[PDB]
Design a protein around this ligand. Structure first.
Ligand code: FDA
Ligand code: NA
Ligand code: NA
Length: 490
């Protein structure tokens, strides 16, 4: 009551929703992307605020401090555990939902842009396209991902070998801190500005907007998608890929999707069929690539083409907010520094991918620019020596069908333990996986020791600096969730 009273005083009432508001269920559900987290057994926010101005965010945070009510911020709602809009255990929180703050302003000539956190990647990419056919930004593959969470947790996609992660291409921010204060890079200082760009969402304050540098791409890029079944030699070919792909020139990224005894090699090349053909013949002849495989197109066209296989529907694929794809979903991730033995690839393709509840495995090769950044230069530590990342994705479509995929996800992660990174076993912060560990709260503050268990997996040697920065900007642990950076204070 106290908290709501404060909000009503400062923010338009049409932007405030209580559980009893008729529109609350659809406001809550509008960017939930995982059917596991939409059902009524999930813990719901007491209130939802949908700011349209930065002053509304500040008022909301000031109210939350005064009345001791915590806020989970949501931009695109893609959090794998839904931590932008649900808690694991009953507790009081409000959601500050940024979907209405979605402006993107591109300065083509300066090659910079200001992008609101509530914009989806598709909208950012489209706006860049309206400004220039030869500029791009290196962020996620899926068009509906929110800018806010994608950037805060790092953010990578088919330009990662060329330009690294989204967070290392951010040149300023506009942020509201745990005391409701408005900050930019200059006011927040090196530590806070280092942490917010890749140190995970929520922990370091609400980013309202990000200023990004825009990067050159040729007017024509080339995509191929070449599949090999095991009888076509997928095992030998992927065994070679793991050594070659991380060593390829930075203009060529070849990722793999596998969902049975068959691997599809999806490439984005910053250039033409005419130069890709000889490069492949020279560096990776085992794949058997020829000019018939080439799909030449602009960078903007490559986004729906890579993610959805569509060539013909630019605006609908990039500017969509209908939220129609809502699988029940589980996800895990690993990083690989040493080549798998051929026998492991044999097991993966022939055995693991043919079990009840078996999911899809995606393999993104590193090296080049992403690996050239030192491990501590940003909070994202998965850099020098990384051959590839693995994402293990399970989708299902009926609420009664969870047992087999959940069980497969657990089993394959156990199987893979000897072959992937260890001490710690690294994982990508934006592929959030609560089973890596969760925080313990003592005297209303997340403990450092509990945070460290999962924190070293996402952030490796960067965890302690993240926590010291957290202690400086938010010593009372106001902006938190079950897996956010704990404050390390003296
Ligand atoms: C759903 C999904 C997710 C990803 C891909 C595809 C699809 C369909 N593919 C992908 C991803 N990540 C990549 O780097 N490359 C890819 O190709 N996926 C994961 C995605 O990057 C993460 O889920 C990301 O955190 C989602 O961001 P979001 O859509 O904005 O999600 P939430 O609103 O749930 O927020 C996540 C997390 O960050 C905090 N948060 C949200 N907004 C802010 C702001 N403005 N400031 C600070 N912190 C923020 C949330 O509280 C939550 O903890
Ligand atoms: Na290690
Ligand atoms: Na999970």
């Amino acid at each position: 009551e106290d908290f709501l009273g404060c909000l009503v005083k400062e923010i338009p009432p049409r932007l405030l929703y209580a559980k009893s508001s008729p529109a609350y269920p659809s406001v809550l559900g509008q960017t939930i992307r995982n059917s596991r987290w939409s059902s009524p057994d999930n813990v719901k926010p007491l209130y939802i605020i949908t700011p349209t101005q930065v002053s509304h965010i500040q008022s909301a945070v000031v109210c939350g401090r005064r009345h001791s009510v915590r806020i989970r911020v949501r931009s695109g709602g893609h959090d794998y555990e839904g931590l932008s809009y649900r808690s694991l255990q009953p507790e009081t929180f409000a959601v500050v939902d940024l979907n209405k703050m979605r402006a993107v302003w591109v300065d083509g000539k300066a090659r910079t842009a200001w992008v609101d956190s509530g914009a989806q990647l598709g909208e950012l990419y489209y706006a860049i396209y309206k400004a220039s056919p030869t500029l791009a930004f290196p962020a996620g593959v899926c068009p509906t991902i929110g800018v806010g969470g994608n950037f805060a947790g790092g953010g990578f996609g088919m330009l990662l070998r060329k330009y690294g992660i989204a967070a290392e291409n951010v040149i300023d921010v506009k942020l509201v801190d745990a005391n409701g204060k408005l900050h930019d890079k200059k006011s927040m200082g090196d530590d806070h500005f280092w942490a917010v760009r890749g140190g995970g969402g929520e922990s370091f304050g609400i980013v309202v907007a990000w200023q990004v540098k825009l990067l050159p791409v040729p007017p024509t890029v080339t995509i191929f998608k070449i599949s090999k079944t095991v009888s076509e030699g997928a095992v030998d070919i992927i065994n070679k890929w793991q050594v070659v792909a991380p060593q390829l020139p930075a203009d060529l990224m070849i990722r793999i999707i596998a969902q049975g005894p068959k691997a599809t090699f999806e490439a984005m090349y910053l250039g033409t069929c005419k130069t890709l053909t000889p490069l492949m013949s020279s560096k990776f002849p085992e794949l058997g690539m020829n000019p018939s495989h080439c799909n030449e197109m602009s960078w903007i066209q490559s986004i729906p083409f890579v993610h959805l296989g569509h060539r013909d529907a630019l605006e609908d694929d990039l500017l969509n907010r209908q939220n129609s794809f809502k699988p029940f979903a589980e996800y895990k991730s690993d990083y690989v520094y040493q080549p798998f033995p051929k026998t492991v690839w044999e097991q993966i393709l022939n055995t693991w991918l043919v079990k009840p509840g078996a999911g899809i495995m995606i393999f993104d090769p590193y090296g080049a620019t992403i690996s050239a950044t030192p491990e501590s230069a940003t909070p994202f530590p998965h850099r020098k020596g990384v051959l590839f990342n693995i994402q293990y994705v399970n989708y299902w479509f009926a609420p009664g069908a969870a047992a087999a995929p959940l069980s497969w996800s657990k089993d394959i992660y156990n199987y893979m333990e000897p072959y992937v990174s260890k001490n710690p076993r690294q994982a990508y912060a934006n592929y959030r996986d609560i089973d890596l560990g969760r925080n313990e709260v003592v005297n209303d503050v997340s403990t450092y020791a509990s945070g460290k268990v999962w924190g070293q997996k996402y952030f490796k040697g960067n965890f302690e600096r993240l926590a010291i920065t957290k202690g400086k900007v938010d010593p009372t642990d106001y902006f938190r969730n079950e897996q956010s950076i704990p404050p390390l204070i003296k």
